[PDB]
Tab-separated table of N, CA and C in Angstrom:
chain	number	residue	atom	x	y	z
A	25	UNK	N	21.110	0.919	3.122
A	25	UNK	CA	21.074	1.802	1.902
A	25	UNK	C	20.395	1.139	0.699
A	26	UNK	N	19.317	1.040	1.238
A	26	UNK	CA	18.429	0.548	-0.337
A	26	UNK	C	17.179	1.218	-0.465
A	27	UNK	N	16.405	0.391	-1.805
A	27	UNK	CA	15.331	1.718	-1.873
A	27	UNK	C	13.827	2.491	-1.371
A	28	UNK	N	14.141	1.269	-0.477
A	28	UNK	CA	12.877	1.993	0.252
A	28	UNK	C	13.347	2.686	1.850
A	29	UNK	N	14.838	2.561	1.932
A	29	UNK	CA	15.382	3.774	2.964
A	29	UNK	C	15.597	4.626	1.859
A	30	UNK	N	16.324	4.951	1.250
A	30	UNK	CA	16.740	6.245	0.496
A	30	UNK	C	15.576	7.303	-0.173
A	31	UNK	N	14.224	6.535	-0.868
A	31	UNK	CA	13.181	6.960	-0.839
A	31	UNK	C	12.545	7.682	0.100
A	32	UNK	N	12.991	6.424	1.551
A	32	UNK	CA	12.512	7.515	2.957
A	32	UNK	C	10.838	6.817	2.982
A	33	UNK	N	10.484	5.766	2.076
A	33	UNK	CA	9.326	4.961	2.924
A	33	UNK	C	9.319	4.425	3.956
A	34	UNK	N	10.821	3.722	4.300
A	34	UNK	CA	11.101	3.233	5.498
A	34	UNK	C	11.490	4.523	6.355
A	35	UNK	N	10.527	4.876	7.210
A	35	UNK	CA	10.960	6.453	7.628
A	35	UNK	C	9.340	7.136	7.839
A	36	UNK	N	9.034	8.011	6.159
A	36	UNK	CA	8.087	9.026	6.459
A	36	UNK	C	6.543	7.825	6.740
A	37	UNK	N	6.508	6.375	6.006
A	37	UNK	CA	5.943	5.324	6.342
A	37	UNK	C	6.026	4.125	6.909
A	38	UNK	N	6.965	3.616	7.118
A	38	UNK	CA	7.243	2.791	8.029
A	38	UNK	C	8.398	2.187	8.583
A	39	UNK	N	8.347	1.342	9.496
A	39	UNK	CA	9.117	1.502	10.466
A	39	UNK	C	10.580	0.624	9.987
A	40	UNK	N	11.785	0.452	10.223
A	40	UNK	CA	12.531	-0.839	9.656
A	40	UNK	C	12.109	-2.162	9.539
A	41	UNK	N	11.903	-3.236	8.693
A	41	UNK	CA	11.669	-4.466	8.787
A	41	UNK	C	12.431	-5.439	7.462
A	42	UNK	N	12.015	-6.773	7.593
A	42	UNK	CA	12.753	-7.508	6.981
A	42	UNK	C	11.747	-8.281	5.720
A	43	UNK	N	11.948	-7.479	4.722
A	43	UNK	CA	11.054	-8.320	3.256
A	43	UNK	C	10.867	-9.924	3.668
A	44	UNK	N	9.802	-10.635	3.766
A	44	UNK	CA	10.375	-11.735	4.013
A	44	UNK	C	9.144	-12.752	2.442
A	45	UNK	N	7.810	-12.222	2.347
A	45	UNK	CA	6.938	-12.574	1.148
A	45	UNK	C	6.495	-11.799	0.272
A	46	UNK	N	6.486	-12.522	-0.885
A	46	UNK	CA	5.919	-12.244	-2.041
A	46	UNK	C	5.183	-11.225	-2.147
A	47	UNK	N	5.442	-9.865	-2.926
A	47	UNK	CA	4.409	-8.831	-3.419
A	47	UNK	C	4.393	-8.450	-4.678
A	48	UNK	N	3.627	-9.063	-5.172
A	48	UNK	CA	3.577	-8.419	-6.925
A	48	UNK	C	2.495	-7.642	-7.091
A	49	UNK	N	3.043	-6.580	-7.703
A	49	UNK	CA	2.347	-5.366	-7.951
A	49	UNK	C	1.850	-5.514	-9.730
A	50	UNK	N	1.000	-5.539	-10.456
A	50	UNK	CA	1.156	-5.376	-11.529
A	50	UNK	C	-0.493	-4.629	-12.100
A	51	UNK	N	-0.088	-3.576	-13.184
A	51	UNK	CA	-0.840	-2.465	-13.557
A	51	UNK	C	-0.736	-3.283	-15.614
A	52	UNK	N	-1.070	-3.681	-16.194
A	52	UNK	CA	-1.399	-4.322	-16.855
A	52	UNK	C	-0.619	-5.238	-17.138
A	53	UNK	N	0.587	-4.728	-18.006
A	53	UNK	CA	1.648	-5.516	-17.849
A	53	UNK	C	3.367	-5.569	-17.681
A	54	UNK	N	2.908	-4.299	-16.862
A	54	UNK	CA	4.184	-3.658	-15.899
A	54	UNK	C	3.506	-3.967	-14.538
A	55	UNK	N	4.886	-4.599	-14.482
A	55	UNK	CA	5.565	-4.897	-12.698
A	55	UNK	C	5.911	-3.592	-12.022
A	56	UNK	N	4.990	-2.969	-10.979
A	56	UNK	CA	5.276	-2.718	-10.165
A	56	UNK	C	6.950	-2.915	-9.722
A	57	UNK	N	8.263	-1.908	-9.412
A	57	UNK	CA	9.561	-2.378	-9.191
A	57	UNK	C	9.699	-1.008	-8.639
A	58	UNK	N	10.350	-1.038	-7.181
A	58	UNK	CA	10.544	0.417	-6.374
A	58	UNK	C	11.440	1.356	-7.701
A	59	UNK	N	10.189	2.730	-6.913
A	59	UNK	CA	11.220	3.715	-7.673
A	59	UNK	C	10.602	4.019	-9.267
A	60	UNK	N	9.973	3.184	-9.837
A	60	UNK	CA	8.971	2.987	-11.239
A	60	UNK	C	8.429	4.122	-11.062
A	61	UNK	N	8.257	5.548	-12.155
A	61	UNK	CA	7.388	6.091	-12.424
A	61	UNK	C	6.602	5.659	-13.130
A	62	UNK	N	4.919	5.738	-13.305
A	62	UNK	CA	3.534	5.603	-14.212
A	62	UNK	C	3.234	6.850	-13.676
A	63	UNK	N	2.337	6.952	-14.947
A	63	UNK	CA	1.737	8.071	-15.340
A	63	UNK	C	-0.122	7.781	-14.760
A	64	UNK	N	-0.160	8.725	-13.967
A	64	UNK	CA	-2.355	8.323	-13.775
A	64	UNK	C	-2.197	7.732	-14.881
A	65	UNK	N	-2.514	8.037	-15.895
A	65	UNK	CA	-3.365	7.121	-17.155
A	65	UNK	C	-3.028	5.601	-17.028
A	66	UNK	N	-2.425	5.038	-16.678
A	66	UNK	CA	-1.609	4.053	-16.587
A	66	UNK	C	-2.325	2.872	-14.888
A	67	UNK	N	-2.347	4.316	-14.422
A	67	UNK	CA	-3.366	3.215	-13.012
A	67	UNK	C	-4.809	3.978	-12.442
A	68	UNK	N	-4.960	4.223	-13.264
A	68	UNK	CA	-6.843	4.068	-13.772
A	68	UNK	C	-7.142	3.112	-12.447
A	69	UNK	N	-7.089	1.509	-13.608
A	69	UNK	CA	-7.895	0.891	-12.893
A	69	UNK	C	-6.933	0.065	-11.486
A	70	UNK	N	-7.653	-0.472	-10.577
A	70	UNK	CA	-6.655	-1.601	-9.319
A	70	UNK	C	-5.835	-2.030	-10.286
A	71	UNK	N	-4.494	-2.614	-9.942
A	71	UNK	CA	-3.457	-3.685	-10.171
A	71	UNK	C	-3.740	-4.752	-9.827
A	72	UNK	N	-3.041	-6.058	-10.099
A	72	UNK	CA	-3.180	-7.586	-10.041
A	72	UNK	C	-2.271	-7.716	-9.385
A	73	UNK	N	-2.663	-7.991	-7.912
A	73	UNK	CA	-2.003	-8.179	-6.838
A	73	UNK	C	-1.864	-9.929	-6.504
A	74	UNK	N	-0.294	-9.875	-6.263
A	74	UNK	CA	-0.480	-11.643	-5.852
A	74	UNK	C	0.678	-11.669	-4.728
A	75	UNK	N	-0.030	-12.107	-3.875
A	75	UNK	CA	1.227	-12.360	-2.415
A	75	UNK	C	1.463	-13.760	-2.306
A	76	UNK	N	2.522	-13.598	-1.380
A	76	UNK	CA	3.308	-14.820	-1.351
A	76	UNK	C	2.751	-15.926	0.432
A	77	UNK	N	3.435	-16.719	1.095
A	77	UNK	CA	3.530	-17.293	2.190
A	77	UNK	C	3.946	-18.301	2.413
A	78	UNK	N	3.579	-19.193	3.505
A	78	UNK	CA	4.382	-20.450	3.666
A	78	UNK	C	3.287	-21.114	4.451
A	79	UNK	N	2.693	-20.793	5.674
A	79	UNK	CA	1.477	-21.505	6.173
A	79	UNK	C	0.241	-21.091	5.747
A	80	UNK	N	-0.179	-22.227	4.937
A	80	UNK	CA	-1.831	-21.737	4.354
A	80	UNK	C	-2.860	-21.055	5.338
A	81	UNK	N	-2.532	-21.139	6.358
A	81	UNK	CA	-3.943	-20.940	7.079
A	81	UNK	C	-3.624	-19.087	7.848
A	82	UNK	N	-2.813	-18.857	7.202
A	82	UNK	CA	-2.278	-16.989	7.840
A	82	UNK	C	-2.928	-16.009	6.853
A	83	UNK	N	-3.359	-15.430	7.062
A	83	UNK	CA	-4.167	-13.937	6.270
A	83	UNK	C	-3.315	-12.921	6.366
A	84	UNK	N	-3.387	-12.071	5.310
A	84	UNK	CA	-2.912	-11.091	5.267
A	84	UNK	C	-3.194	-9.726	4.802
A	85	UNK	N	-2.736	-8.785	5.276
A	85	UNK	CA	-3.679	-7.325	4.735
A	85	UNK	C	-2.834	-6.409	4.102
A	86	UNK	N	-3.736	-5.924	2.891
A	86	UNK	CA	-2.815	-4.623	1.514
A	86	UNK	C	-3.185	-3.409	2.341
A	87	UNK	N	-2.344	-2.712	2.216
A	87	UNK	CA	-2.076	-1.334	2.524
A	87	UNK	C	-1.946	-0.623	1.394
A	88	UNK	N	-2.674	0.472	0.263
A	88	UNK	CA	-2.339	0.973	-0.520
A	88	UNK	C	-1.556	2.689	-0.019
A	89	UNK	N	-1.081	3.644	0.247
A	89	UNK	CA	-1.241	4.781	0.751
A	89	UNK	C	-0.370	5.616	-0.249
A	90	UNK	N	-0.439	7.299	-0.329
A	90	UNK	CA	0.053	7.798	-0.862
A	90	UNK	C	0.794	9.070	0.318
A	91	UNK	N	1.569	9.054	0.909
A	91	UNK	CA	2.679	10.027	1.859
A	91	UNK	C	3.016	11.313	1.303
A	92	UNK	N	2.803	11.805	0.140
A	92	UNK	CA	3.491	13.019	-0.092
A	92	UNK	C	1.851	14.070	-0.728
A	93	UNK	N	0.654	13.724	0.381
A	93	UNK	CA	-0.753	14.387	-0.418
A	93	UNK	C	-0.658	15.785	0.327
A	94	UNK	N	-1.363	16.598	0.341
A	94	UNK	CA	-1.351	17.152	-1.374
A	94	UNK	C	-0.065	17.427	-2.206
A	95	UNK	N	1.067	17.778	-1.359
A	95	UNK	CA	2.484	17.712	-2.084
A	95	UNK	C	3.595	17.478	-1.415
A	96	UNK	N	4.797	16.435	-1.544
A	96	UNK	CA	5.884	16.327	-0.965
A	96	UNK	C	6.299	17.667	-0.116
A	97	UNK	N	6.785	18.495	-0.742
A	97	UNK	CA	6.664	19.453	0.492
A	97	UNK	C	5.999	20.238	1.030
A	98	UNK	N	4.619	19.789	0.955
A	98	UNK	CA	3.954	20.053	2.881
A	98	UNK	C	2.634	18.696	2.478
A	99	UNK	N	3.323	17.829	2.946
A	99	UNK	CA	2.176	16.756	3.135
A	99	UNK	C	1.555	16.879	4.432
A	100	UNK	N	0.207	17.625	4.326
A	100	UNK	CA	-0.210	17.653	5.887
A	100	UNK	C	-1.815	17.113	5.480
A	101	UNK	N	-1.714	16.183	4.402
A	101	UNK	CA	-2.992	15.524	4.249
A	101	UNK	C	-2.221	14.171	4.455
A	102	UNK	N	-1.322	13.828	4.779
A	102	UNK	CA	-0.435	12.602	4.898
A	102	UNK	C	-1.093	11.379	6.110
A	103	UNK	N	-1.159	10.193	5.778
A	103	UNK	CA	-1.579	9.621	4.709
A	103	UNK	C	-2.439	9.391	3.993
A	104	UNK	N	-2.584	9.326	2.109
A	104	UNK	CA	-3.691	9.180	1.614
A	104	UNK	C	-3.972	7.702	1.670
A	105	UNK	N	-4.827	7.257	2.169
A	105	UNK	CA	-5.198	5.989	1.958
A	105	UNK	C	-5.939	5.655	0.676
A	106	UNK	N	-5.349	5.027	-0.329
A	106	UNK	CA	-5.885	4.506	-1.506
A	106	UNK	C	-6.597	3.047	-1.606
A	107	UNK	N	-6.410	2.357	-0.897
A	107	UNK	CA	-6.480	1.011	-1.309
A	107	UNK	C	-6.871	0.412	0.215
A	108	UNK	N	-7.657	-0.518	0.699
A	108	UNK	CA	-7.626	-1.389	1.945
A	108	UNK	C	-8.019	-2.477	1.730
A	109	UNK	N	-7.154	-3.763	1.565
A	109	UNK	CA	-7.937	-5.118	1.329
A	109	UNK	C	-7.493	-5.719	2.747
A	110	UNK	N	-7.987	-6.694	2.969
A	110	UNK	CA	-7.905	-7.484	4.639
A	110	UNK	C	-8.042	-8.654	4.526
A	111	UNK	N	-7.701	-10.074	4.945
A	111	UNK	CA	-8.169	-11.374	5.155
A	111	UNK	C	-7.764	-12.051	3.817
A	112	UNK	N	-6.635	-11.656	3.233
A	112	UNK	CA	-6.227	-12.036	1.962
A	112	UNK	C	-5.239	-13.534	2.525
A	113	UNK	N	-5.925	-14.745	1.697
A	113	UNK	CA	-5.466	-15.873	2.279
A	113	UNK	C	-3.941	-15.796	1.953
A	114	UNK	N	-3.336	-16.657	2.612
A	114	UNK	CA	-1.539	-16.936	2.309
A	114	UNK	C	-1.577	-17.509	1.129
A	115	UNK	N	-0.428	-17.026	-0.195
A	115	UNK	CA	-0.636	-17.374	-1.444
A	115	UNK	C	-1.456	-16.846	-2.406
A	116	UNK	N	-2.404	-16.446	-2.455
A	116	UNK	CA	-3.110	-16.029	-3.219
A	116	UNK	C	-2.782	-14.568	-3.865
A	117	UNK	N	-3.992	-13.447	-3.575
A	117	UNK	CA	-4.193	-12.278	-4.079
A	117	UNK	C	-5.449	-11.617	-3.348
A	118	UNK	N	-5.332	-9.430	-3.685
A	118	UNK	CA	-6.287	-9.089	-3.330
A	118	UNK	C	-7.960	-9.730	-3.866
A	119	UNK	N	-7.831	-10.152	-5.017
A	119	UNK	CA	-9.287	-11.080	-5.570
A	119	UNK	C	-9.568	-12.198	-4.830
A	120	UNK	N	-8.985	-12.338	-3.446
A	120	UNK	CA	-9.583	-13.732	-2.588
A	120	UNK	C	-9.395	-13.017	-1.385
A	121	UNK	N	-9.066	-11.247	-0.782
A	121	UNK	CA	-9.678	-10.938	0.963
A	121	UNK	C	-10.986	-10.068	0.656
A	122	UNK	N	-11.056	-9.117	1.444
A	122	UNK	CA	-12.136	-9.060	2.201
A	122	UNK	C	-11.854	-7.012	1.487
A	123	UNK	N	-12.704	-6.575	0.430
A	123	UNK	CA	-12.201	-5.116	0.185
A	123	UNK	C	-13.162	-4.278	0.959
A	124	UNK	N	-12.451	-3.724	1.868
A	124	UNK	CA	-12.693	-2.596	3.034
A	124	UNK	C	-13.028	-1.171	2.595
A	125	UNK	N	-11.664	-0.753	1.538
A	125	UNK	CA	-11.941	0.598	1.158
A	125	UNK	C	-11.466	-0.068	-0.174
A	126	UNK	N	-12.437	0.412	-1.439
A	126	UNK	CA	-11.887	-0.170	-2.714
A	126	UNK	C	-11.351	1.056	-3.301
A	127	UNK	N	-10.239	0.594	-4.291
A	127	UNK	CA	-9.097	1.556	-4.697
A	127	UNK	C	-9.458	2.459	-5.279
A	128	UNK	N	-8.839	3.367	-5.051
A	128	UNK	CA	-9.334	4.661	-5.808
A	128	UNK	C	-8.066	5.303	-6.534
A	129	UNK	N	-8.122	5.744	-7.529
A	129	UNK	CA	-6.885	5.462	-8.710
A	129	UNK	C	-6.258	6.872	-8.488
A	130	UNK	N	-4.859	7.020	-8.234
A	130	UNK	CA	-4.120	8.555	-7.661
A	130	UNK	C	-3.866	9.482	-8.791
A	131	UNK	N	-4.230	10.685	-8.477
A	131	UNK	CA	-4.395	11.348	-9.793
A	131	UNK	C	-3.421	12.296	-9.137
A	132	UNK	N	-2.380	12.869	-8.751
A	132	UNK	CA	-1.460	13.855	-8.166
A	132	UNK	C	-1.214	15.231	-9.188
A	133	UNK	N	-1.095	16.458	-7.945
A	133	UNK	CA	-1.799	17.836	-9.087
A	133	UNK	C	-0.943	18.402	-8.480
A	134	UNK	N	0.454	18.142	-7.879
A	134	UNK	CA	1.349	18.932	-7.237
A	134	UNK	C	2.612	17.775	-6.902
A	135	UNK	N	4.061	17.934	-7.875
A	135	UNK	CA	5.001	16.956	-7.549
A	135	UNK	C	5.158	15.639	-7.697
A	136	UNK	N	5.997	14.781	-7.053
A	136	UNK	CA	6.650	13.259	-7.333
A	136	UNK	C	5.522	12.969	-5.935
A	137	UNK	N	4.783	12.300	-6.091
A	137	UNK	CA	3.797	11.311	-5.208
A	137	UNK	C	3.965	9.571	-5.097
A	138	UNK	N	4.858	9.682	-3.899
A	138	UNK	CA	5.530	8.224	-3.548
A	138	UNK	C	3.879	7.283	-3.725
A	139	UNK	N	3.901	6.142	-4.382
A	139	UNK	CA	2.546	5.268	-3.796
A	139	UNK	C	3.357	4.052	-3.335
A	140	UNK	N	2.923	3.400	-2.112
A	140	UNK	CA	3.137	2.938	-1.697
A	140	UNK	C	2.003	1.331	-1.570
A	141	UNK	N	3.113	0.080	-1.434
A	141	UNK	CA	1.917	-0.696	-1.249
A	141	UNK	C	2.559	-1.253	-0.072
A	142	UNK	N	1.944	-2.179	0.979
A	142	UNK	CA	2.596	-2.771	2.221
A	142	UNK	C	1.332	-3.721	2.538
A	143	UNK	N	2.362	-4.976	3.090
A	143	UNK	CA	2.022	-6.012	3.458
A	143	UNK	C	2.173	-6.243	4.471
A	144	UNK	N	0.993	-6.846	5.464
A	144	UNK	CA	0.756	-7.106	6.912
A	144	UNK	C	0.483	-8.519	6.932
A	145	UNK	N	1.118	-9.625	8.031
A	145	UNK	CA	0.513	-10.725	8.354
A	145	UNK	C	-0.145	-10.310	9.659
A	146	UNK	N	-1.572	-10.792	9.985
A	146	UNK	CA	-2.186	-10.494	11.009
A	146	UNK	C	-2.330	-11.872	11.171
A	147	UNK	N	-2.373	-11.977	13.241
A	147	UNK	CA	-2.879	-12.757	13.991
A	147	UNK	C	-3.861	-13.902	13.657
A	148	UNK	N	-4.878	-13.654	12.798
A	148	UNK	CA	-6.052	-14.210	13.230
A	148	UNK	C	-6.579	-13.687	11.764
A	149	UNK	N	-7.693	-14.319	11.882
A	149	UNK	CA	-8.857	-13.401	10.918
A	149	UNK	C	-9.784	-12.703	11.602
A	150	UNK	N	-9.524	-11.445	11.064
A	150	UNK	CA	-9.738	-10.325	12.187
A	150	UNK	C	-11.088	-9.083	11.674
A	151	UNK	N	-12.179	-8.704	12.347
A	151	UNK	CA	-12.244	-7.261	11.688
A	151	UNK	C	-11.583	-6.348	11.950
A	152	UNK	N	-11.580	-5.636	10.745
A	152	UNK	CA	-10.948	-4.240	10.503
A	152	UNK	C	-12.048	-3.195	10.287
A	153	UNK	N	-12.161	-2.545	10.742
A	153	UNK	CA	-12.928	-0.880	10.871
A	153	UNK	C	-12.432	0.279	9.470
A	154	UNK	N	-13.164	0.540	8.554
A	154	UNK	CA	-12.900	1.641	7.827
A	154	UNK	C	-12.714	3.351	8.140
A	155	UNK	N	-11.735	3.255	8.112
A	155	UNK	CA	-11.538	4.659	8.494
A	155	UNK	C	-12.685	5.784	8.030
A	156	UNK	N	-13.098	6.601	8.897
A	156	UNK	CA	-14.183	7.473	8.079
A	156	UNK	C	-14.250	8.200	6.575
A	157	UNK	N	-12.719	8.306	6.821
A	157	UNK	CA	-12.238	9.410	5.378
A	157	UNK	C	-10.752	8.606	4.683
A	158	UNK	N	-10.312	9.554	3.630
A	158	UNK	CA	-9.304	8.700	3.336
A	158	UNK	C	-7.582	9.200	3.936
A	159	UNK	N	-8.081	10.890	3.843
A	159	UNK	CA	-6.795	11.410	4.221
A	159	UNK	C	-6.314	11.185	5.687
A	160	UNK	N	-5.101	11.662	6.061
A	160	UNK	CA	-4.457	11.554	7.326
A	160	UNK	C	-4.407	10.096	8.050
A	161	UNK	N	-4.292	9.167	6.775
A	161	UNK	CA	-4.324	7.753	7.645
A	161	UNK	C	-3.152	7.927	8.236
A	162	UNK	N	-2.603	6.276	9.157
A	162	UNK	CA	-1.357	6.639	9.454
A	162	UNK	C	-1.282	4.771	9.824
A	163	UNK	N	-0.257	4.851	8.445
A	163	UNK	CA	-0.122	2.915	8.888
A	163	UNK	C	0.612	2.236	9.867
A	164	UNK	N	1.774	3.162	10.362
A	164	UNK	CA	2.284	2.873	11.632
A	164	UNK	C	1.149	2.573	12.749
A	165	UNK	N	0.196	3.535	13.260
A	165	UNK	CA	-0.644	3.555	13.952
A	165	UNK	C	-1.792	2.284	13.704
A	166	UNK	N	-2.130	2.397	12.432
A	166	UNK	CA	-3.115	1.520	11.768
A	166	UNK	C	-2.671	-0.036	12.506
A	167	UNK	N	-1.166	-0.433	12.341
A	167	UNK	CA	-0.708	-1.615	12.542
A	167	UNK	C	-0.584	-1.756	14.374
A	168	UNK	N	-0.801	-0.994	14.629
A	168	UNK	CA	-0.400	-1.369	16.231
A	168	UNK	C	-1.745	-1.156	17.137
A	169	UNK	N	-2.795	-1.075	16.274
A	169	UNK	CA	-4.398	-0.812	16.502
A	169	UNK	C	-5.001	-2.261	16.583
A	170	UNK	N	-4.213	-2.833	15.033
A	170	UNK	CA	-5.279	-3.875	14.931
A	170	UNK	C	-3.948	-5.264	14.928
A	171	UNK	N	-3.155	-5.049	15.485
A	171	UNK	CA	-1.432	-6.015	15.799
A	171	UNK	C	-1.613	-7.021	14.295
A	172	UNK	N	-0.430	-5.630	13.638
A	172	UNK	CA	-0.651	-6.422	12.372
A	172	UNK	C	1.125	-6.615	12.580
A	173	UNK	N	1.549	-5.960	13.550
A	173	UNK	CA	3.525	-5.741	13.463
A	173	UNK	C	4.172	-5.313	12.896
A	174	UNK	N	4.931	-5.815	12.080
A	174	UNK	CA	5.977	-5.192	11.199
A	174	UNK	C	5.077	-5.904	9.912
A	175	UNK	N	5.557	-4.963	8.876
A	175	UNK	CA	5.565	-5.254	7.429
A	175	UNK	C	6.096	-6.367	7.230
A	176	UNK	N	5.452	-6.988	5.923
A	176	UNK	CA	6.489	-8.570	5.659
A	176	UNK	C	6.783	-8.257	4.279
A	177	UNK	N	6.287	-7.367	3.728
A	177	UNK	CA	6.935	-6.889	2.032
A	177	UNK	C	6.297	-5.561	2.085
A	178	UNK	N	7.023	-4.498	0.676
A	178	UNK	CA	6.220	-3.224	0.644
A	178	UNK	C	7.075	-3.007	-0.871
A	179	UNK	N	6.851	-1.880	-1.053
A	179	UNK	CA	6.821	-1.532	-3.084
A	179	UNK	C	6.408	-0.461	-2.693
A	180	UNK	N	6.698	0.317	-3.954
A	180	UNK	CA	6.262	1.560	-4.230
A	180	UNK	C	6.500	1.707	-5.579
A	181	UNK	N	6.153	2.541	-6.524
A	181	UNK	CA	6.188	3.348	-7.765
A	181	UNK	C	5.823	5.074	-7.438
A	182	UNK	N	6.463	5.847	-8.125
A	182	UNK	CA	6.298	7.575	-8.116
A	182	UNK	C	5.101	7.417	-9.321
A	183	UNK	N	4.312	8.772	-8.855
A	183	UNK	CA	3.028	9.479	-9.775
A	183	UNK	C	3.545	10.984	-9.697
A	184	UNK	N	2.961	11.458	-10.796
A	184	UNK	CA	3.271	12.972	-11.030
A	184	UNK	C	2.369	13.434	-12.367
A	185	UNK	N	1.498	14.782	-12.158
A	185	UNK	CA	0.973	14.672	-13.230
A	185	UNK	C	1.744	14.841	-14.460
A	186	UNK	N	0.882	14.581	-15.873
A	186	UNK	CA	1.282	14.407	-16.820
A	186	UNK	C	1.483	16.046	-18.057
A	187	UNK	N	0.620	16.994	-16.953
A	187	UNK	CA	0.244	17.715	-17.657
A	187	UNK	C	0.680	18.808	-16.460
């Protein structure tokens, strides 16, 4: 019973797992903290992403997605993929992997729009393939494509328009 079951990320996005590194989310100078509403105006531009680890030599990959597109109740554009960074060294941040799909800032025109961020340790240093489009990703699938496993951290903040 915490907040990324009760939210239902662990669920409509991913699968049970155990937080184990560092994810800081930050949009200028707000922290990213589950459950945080911002307003679009507010994430315009990418956030200052900094992850955590323990063996220098492990990479890791950002997952940005948004689960409730075009609206919580009937997401059948589900998932929006916002964000794809890859090969992000252990310790660091997205400003040291590899940007795949660069972020594109969520502007939501219908309801509470979960955003989601999630963290993958992968195998190896690996390519990753860009999805053609952004909608109908699916990170469950995504992770068992390219054996990224379970999540090792994830976050979220709600969007909703302002107007």
């Amino acid at each position: 019973r915490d907040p990324l079951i009760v939210s239902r990320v662990v669920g409509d996005v991913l699968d049970p797992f155990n937080r184990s590194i560092t994810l800081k989310v930050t949009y200028g100078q707000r922290e990213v903290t589950n459950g945080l509403n911002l307003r679009p105006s507010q994430v315009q531009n990418k956030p200052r992403v900094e992850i955590g680890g323990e063996d220098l030599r492990n990479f890791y990959t950002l997952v940005m997605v948004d689960p409730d597109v075009p609206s919580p109740s009937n997401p059948h554009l589900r998932e929006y993929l916002h964000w794809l960074v890859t090969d992000i060294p252990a310790t660091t941040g997205t400003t040291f992997g590899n940007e795949i799909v660069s972020y594109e800032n969520p502007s939501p025109t219908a309801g509470i729009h979960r955003v989601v961020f999630i963290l993958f340790r992968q195998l190896g240093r690996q390519t990753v393939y860009a999805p053609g489009w952004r909608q109908n990703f699916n990170t469950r699938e995504f992770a068992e494509i390219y054996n990224l496993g379970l999540p090792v951290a994830a976050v979220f903040y709600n969007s909703q328009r302002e107007s």
